[PDB]
Amino acid sequence: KTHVQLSLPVLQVRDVLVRGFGDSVEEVLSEARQHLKDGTCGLVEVEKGVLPQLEQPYVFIKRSDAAPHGHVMVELVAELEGIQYGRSGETLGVLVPHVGEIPVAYRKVLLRK
Numbered sequence: 001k002t003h004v005q006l007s008l009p010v011l012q013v014r015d016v017l018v019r020g021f022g023d024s025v026e027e028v029l030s031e032a033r034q035h036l037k038d039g040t041c042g043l044v045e046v047e048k049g050v051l052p053q054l055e056q057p058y059v060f061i062k063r064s065d066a067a068p069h070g071h072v073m074v075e076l077v078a079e080l081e082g083i084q085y086g087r088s089g090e091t092l093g094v095l096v097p098h099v100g101e102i103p104v105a106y107r108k109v110l111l112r113k
Contacts, residue, residue: 009103020055042098062088071110
């Protein structure tokens with residue numbers, strides 16, 4: 001399928017144990033896609049002071065359409081030193097590895113894969 005329905009656990013930034021996916025734009029997008037597929041991907045909602053607590057490159061999920069079965073359509077955009085790789089709508093949050101942190105909520109997304 002071109003799109004996959006996911007429910008992403010929303011994590012508080014101070015709980016996150018692994019604060020990024022890797023060390024290059026290409027690696028973080030690769031790793032983020034693999035974790036999204038394996039159900040091992042969390043979402044941190046972006047506010048003042050969140051991003052400086054996480055590791056670059058960042059992976060964002062961004063609204064790609066204006067929501068089948070409650071799932072917002074999203075795509076991946078990476079960022080490193082203020083340059084973004086991809087073009088999409090508003091940020092739903094930043095993706096991180098999920099290694100058993102207790103979530104505060106779930107974000108239903110439809111991921112363009």
